[PDB]
């Protein structure tokens, strides 16, 4: 009786697409997914312009490389969303179980609240001007190629950061957990002193920033010194 609601909706949705949309293949996968109570729904690369109500038991939603502009409500056990290479203008409210969200190469203008269990956020090549407050378990933040004017404070387990090709004017202090920081092509004129305290194996790319003369001397007095044991910093 629950299944009939879904089969009916998917049935109705299958007949209302444009002829490029591979709705028939999608309908069959949704069917197999619901009836086998499958963990992953894979509708990727099916030229879809909308999605219907989704099977409620899934933990992975694999919908990359479609033509979606919005998503339906996200099922409340989802752990991984691969939504990159669509035309999304926004995302719906994110489930509390969500751990990995990839929505790179979309048109997203703002993100919704980021839930507390999120560890990987990949939203490069969007239209973001601001980021939500970053949750405490975040390990990877990829936001390169947006329109970011500023970036929130970094939580203390963040290990990878990419924010290249934005408009950022100030960089918050970097946690020692950071091993990889792509800061290239922003509007920075100074760097936080914590950059020099990152691990010796850490990498920082700060090319394409208008770093001031005093910044350059301050840093290179340390990075060019003989006893320097901080990260490798690329300035150009």
């Amino acid at each position: 009786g629950s299944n009939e609601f879904y089969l009916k909706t998917w049935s109705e949705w299958e007949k209302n697409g444009t002829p490029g949309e591979q709705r028939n293949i999608a309908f069959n996968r949704l069917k197999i997914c619901l009836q086998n109570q499958e963990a992953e729904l894979n509708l990727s690369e099916l030229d879809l312009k909308t999605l219907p109500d989704l099977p409620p038991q899934i933990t992975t939603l694999e919908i990359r490389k479609n033509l979606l502009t919005h998503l339906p409500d996200l099922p409340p056990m989802l752990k991984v969303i691969h939504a990159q290479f669509n035309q999304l203008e926004s995302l719906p409210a994110l489930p509390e179980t969500l751990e990995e969200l990839n929505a790179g190469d979309n048109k997203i203008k703002e993100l919704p609240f980021l839930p507390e269990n999120l560890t990987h956020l990949r939203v490069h090549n969007n239209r973001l001007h601001i980021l939500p407050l970053l949750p405490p378990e975040l390990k990877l933040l990829v936001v390169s190629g947006n329109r970011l004017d500023s970036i929130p404070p970094f939580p203390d387990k963040l290990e990878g950061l990419a924010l290249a090709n934005n408009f950022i004017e100030q960089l918050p202090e970097l946690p020692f957990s950071m091993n990889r920081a792509v800061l290239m092509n922003n509007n920075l004129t100074t760097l936080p002193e914590s950059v020099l305290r990152l691990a010796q194996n850490a990498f920082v790319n700060v090319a394409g920033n208008p770093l001031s003369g005093h910044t350059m001397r301050t840093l290179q007095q340390i990075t060019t010194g003989p006893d320097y044991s901080g990260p490798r910093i690329f300035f150009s």
Binding site: A162, V182, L183, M184, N205, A207, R232, F234, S236
Partner: protein, 78 residues
């Protein structure tokens, strides 16, 4: 289709980075991965893997990349 750990020496100043690659990856896809993860534009990346300058469409497998700890050198152009 198993992950491979690739030891990469980057020279522009130097840095050693650890990449995780798949043997069917092309050099073009490798350049894209490194662009996003390190900020190096693909057009400026020059890859040397075993006496050869790697061309964009060649695979890592075709250049002998088969096991964890295999090496490649990355040179960054002006």
């Amino acid at each position: 289709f198993q992950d491979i750990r690739l030891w990469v020496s980057v020279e522009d100043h130097t840095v050693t980075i650890w990449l995780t690659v798949r043997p069917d990856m092309t050099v073009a896809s490798l350049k894209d991965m490194v662009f996003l993860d390190y900020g190096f534009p693909p057009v400026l990346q020059q890859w040397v893997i075993g006496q050869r300058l790697a061309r964009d469409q060649e695979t890592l497998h075709s250049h002998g990349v088969r096991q964890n700890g295999d090496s490649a050198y990355l040179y960054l152009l002006s």
